[PDB]
Amino acid sequence: IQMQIFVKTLTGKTITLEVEPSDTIENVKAKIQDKEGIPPDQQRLIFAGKQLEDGRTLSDYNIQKESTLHLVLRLRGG
Amino acid sequence: STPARRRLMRDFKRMKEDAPPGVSASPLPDNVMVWNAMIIGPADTPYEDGTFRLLLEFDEEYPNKPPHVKFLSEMFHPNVYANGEIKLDILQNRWTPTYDVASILTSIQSLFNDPNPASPANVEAATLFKDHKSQYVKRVKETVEKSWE
């Protein structure tokens, strides 16, 4: 049970990920780290106005197939 | 015996007779390198009257290296990580041998008054602190109640 989603920053830069509805926000942030080199602590993910918190899943936020999540970077973020 | 053990007995003597308000700490009877501490949620902060327990761990490099410290109480604060550790520069990049137990605890306690949402260890918490003040306070208060129990 898998779907393509997109993750886009405020700059326009976009990546594509394959995920599952039951992956966690934490799992998703790790994939992003691997794919864009950004530590999960510096990532803020937004979808339909809600910011995504770890230990919740994609399906929880109703993130369905081909959805685009907005990634906001906070530097130094530490 | 060791410089660290010597410095630490000074810190203890300090905490035993002239400890800052709302904070306390003491080694274990049989191991001076490990201390229980407690900071009370200062007045007029959402943390008011919480009893937040911490653990201080030292080794022989003290006081040339800070101790390792973390809360044992459940916390919700923009500068405390999920694992209880604390993002405070004098415990990391900016330590100097002039700090002791007393001054560490009072630096930590002061975060209850003026958090630093600029350096977030807890991102959920930093975010609520800026964007949802009411939601932030409710989370803090939950933490207050748990600290008793």
Numbering used by the authors:
A (entry chain B): -1 to 76
B (entry chain A): 2 to 150
Reproduce the article's own wording on this structure.
Rad6 from the yeast, Saccharomyces cerevisiae, and its human homologues, RAD6A/B, are E2 enzymes that play conserved roles in transcription and DNA repair. Rad6 monoubiquitinates histone H2B at K123 in conjunction with the E3 ligase, Bre1, a modification that is important for transcriptional activation and elongation as well as mRNA splicing. Rad6 also plays a role in DNA repair, monoubiquitinating PCNA in a reaction catalyzed by the Rad18 E3 ligase.
Since the thioester linked Rad6∼Ub conjugate is unstable and thus not suitable for crystallization, we generated a stable Rad6∼Ub conjugate that is not competent for ubiquitin transfer. The largest of the interfaces is between Rad6 of one conjugate and ubiquitin in another, which comprises an interaction area of 446.1 Å2 as calculated with the PISA server. In previous crystallographic and NMR studies of the E2s, UBCH5C and RAD6B, as well as the UEV, Mms2 (19), a hydrophobic patch containing ubiquitin residue I44 interacts with the so-called backside region of the E2 which, in Rad6, is centered on residue S25 (corresponding to S22 of UBCH5C). This region of yeast Rad6, however, does not mediate any contacts in the crystal. Instead, the network of ubiquitin-E2 interactions in crystals of Rad6iso∼Ub is mediated by a non-canonical backside region of Rad6 centered on residue L56 and a patch on ubiquitin centered on F4. Mutations D31A, N37A and L56A significantly decrease polyubiquitination of nucleosomes.
